[PDB]
Amino acid sequence: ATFEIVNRCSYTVWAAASKGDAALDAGGRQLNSGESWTINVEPGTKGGKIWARTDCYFDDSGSGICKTGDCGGLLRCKRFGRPPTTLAEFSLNQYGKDYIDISNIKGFNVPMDFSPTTRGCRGVRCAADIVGQCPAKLKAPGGGCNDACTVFQTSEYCCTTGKCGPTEYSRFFKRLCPDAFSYVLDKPTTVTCPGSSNYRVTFCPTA
């Protein structure tokens, strides 16, 4: 499957793509404002994620640090990134269907649109100013708006027992971005697409 990753933000982001135990394609790349990065993702990929990282510094060898979404200090992410990270999530070719969603379960750093470039389903978007509106206790100093599980590490926010409800914090994310997951047991906002669809992830879609 083809993913076009487009940075419409006025600032540079370092895109990342991983399935948790391996990079997807090159795994990461700098995207200046306006740049597009096309990656190929193996059919059948389960649990892939794409996110943006902000305020990164890397050396010759691709080692460094980012203020949001750092994946163990690598340019080319092999693992998932450190919150806060708005997440484009996808599982491809699952019994003939693709499943895509946007998630705020790991917080929010960059607004995002996640849309098919082929026929048969709709896209999803979280483009509200979540960082500007972020509750004081969830603000990340590096930038971004943390989720409550990351901040407070309770069974209720992290849904560790498999039973949990919405919270004042999850409702904040949900109020600004109804089409994104706001906590683990949120009513699913997953979109079902035809198997082997292609996609575009746009950072700052309303920029």
Domain boundaries, the chain: 1-206
Q: Can you give the resolution of this entry in Å? A: 1.7
Q: Report how far residue 88's alpha carbon sits from residue 180's, in angstroms, rounded to the nearest whole number.
A: 10
The technique is X-ray
Using the Cα atoms of residue 140, residue 146, residue 150 and residue 152 in order, give the sign of their dihedral. positive
Q: Is 62 helix (H, G, I), strand (E, B) or coil?
A: coil
- The CATH superfamily of 1-206 is Thaumatin (2.60.110.10)
How does DSSP classify residue 63?
Answer: B
Classify residue 128 by burial, with Cβ atoms within 10 Å: 0-12, 13-18, 19+.
middle
Tokens of 43: 């059919």
| Whether 104 contacts 114, CB under 8 Å | no
Tokens of 164: 């949990």
Please report, in angstroms and rounded to a whole number, the separation of the first and last CA atoms in the chain: 27
Q: Report how far residue 81's alpha carbon sits from residue 65's, in angstroms, rounded to the nearest whole number.
A: 11
Tokens of 17: 């793509």
| 199-203 and 2-7 beta bridge pairing | parallel
Dihedral angle over CA of 198, 100, 69, 206, nearest 10: 70
User: How many other CB atoms are found less than 10 A from the CB of residue 129?
Assistant: 11
As a whole number of angstroms, the longest Cα–Cα distance in the chain is: 46
